[PDB]
Design a protein around this ligand. Sequence first.
Ligand SMILES: CC(=O)SCCNC(=O)CCNC(=O)[C@H](O)C(C)(C)COP(=O)(O)OP(=O)(O)OC[C@H]1O[C@@H](n2cnc3c(N)ncnc32)[C@H](O)[C@@H]1OP(=O)(O)O
Ligand SMILES: CC(=O)SCCNC(=O)CCNC(=O)[C@H](O)C(C)(C)COP(=O)(O)OP(=O)(O)OC[C@H]1O[C@@H](n2cnc3c(N)ncnc32)[C@H](O)[C@@H]1OP(=O)(O)O
Lengths: 247, 247, 301, 301
Amino acid sequence: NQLTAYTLRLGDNCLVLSQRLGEWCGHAPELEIDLALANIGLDLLGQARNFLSYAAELAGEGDEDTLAFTRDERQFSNLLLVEQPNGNFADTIARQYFIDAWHVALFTRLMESRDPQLAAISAKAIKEARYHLRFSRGWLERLGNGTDVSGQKMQQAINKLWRFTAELFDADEIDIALSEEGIAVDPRTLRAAWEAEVFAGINEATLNVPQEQAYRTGGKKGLHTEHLGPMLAEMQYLQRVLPGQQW
Amino acid sequence: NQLTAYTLRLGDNCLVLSQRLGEWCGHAPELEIDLALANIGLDLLGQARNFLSYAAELAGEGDEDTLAFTRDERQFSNLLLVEQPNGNFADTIARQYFIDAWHVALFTRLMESRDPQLAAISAKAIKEARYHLRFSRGWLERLGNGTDVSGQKMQQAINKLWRFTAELFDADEIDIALSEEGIAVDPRTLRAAWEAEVFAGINEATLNVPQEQAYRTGGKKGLHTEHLGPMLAEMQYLQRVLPGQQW
Amino acid sequence: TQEERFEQRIAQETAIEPQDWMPDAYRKTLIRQIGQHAHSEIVGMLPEGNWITRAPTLRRKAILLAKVQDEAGHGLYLYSAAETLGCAREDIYQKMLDGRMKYSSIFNYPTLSWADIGVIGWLVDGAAIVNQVALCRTSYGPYARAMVKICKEESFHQRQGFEACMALAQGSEAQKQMLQDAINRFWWPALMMFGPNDDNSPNSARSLTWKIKRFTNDELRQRFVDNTVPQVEMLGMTVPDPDLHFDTESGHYRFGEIDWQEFNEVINGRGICNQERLDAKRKAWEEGTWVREAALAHAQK
Amino acid sequence: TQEERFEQRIAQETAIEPQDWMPDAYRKTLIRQIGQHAHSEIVGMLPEGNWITRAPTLRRKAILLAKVQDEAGHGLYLYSAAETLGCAREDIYQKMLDGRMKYSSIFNYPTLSWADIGVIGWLVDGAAIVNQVALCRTSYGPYARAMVKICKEESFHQRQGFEACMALAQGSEAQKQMLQDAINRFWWPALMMFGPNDDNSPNSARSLTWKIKRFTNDELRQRFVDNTVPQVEMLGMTVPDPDLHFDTESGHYRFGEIDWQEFNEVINGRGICNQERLDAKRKAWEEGTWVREAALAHAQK
Ligand SMILES: CC(=O)SCCNC(=O)CCNC(=O)[C@H](O)C(C)(C)COP(=O)(O)OP(=O)(O)OC[C@H]1O[C@@H](n2cnc3c(N)ncnc32)[C@H](O)[C@@H]1OP(=O)(O)O
Ligand SMILES: CC(=O)SCCNC(=O)CCNC(=O)[C@H](O)C(C)(C)COP(=O)(O)OP(=O)(O)OC[C@H]1O[C@@H](n2cnc3c(N)ncnc32)[C@H](O)[C@@H]1OP(=O)(O)O
């Protein structure tokens, strides 16, 4: 159960973020970005399928689809950071950065997990994550150390997502007890590696690591922002109208 | 079934347009507009509720709720004009205005119907339509004759939406068969009332009537734009998730 | 005798009116209280607005639209009353956007299910009504009269909210769970609407003396709990409070300790929706600029 | 002999290459054809993108994301081939946005159900493949080689699209109706992908002579119908055509008359989604400005 809970958190992170990038398809600044974005989303969706497929297995019931489509917002355990609106291009970049940096740190260490499947999944995943971090860092420098306008939008994109970064290092009873068994990675130990990457990246962008203390948690226990309910309605619509079918 | 379908179209216009105004709640340029938009949306939902209940009655199964929540986009029959996105405040006003002028023209003629309940409902409805038209005609000129920035904006809103007006006067097999029994209003006849109100309204704001020949039709036979699907996905979610329940 | 006649009018309970004399601190504290009351009515539109497009039945949807229309209306009534004390509507509204004035702690919580809307309609309106009824005998007349007009209108919607909850209480197993969860996420935040303790209430001394406030924050909170608990048992639900029970000897429902540390974060802008609320109003204000400016330049021809 | 040696290559069929000599009209017509081929790949993302967030299963969703990633890729390959003839990518892309160049008529139709996506994947990709296979032996090398690379990639997704449709053909009653309706809204628009009649094809004379085009618009369309109809009967579906039947004596499927009046509206920008599509691309371009500009100013330090 605790292990299931955890798998789901990781899997829901990827799935939700996946959905967000789906919306950019066709709408990006240039084609290369469109293609870059489609691809990141497909990796993430891929990651989501493996975590959820495992979860479904620990549970002994359902599958990646039942978990993705027959749970409501009070059951989804994604990070609040992944559900935030795409906004303008700098908004999407900022979120992807904070996330890939986190994924890089996390999956680097999760390939060590004493649960083989988790380790197996993170081993595939870290390969992709490093490509994503290259991409999201790529644009952070480009927009902060770019034109006055762009540096400015980028500074603000970062300011407005910042309060959510608190949840990446929040550890709860499930993170602790599974981490003592060396199955999980204590989110608290991830702080160091994340800050080292991000703090550097922002300052190299000639921008400012925000002074304000972060405080937003809850996503992991089903208490989400007001943005998820509408995503789940768009994502699940068909499965809800026509449940129990093959596609 | 002809009459039934004719009813449904009128109710669909109201229901779908209603949803759009819902989205403006809490976000208006001022509180006075907020309340106005709520007040309009409420009238339209009332109108929707009336037309929907008559259709259900005509079909002799289901009710206002089954008709709104358990039909998919292919069966909806609202005009294309109402399903368009809110956009900025002009895009909302422009749409509202073309819609009100047409509702004032429609219900006038329609209270004269040889169907009791269509006439009975249009009688109640024409009372609100004129208040809507005062509101929308009001802002149309406030923005059209406002600043440089507002006038350009109001012009481009009028242009963006124009091509969908063709559908207001499009008379298919159902309009014709029922208008030859004085039950339905034939939409080609409404053209002169509409044009006389709308050309003058636009001219009087020192904007120009668009010069493109309006050409988009299809809503009525269930061929919608790409906007309706996610609207309904949002509107019906809860009902899809938990069907056949008293709320 | 300026200060002295005032003291008596209050004391005899004759309603103070706009162009009377009143202490400078009495005026300032009433602009503060009435302003924030209006701010509450405006912000309160957002959590409720969030479910308009998603409401389960056309009927429930129509009621919710009605409710939100009546909230805007009550905001405007309260700004009118505010302005009779010399302030400007636009001046204090700008203070709300800046965070220099507050609005009810309660709207910094999100609506995560339809049950949420019912529970807000039942408990949150219920808590606001308990407080507004006790304000009907407030010393200031424009305030106390607004309070009457409002309680009259708002309690119609409160019964609607309760009926929506009743439907869930009596519906499918899935509907019952939805309500229980909404109650669970809203019960404690509802109690905090009444404000801090009697030991930690800086305004309470003066407010009671000037009969601006008729009952203490704890007294009103206790009244709310006493009215509401049997309503909860009626629905066959529970309240998320292990310590709640009825105390014969005092004839009150004794209830658990409030998490004041949460209360303090929420009022100081670090709650859940806090920022997404001000952002929403700030955005509606800034994007709305060109529209207000257009309306102005048109009224000039 | 400049013109004379060219005539022979083309004839014995030696592929033409970027820095060869070629008639000025042969160059201009190939930029036109290949450019519009790339435009199609880019616009075609929009109807398919429309259903990404809504796709019924994580598997089907992943496939659709794959497909749209591969379309962008094929656009870029086609622009490269385009640029080998002297044009600029950005120059012709701007012409697309202005409507001075075309893209496939087919993407001016909307995706109104999930079945639409399968049917696009099966019939619309199928119709593009029939056309692209015949282009594998086109006279120009960069084009013909691009056509090989593409057919290789695109037909994996075509079989995926068909399998999606197979899932509906074999599912619930509701699923079968969904597919039948997608077929019904897409069959005729699919046939128009091949272009106008042989009697109304201004480009056809020259294209065939220079072996740019290997088969007539009607010939390819006939091939498509012949391949596809048994696939339809296999699914236990029908085609929205009363006149369709198999003609023994000619060994082809004889089929109905195309609504050329619709075809002419669609290509002239007055179809269902024409405006919504160019708007969408125009918006992506304008709003993206500050981002391209920032990328430029950064590559300068
Ligand atoms: C749901 C709706 O439609 S509105 C909901 C109910 N709204 C209201 O009651 C608003 C009108 N205000 C009041 O009735 C009173 O201010 C009370 C009873 C809420 C609080 O008592 P007070 O005497 O004003 O303040 P008190 O000394 O108890 O507390 C100290 C501070 O915390 C504030 N506070 C107390 N409760 C809350 C709350 N729930 N949310 C935000 N701020 C609060 C007080 O306003 C005061 O701040 P301030 O001086 O910056 O304005
Ligand atoms: C789904 C996908 O990924 S791409 C879909 C398929 N796309 C393509 O094949 C694009 C590449 N183009 C071609 O193969 C060819 O141009 C054909 C076969 C489509 C048309 O034949 P042509 O010799 O170019 O033109 P033709 O003389 O037959 O017709 C006259 C006009 O109608 C245009 N036309 C014909 N069919 C279409 C169509 N389906 N959509 C838009 N325009 C069309 C022609 O391009 C030409 O316009 P132009 O001279 O302004 O460019």
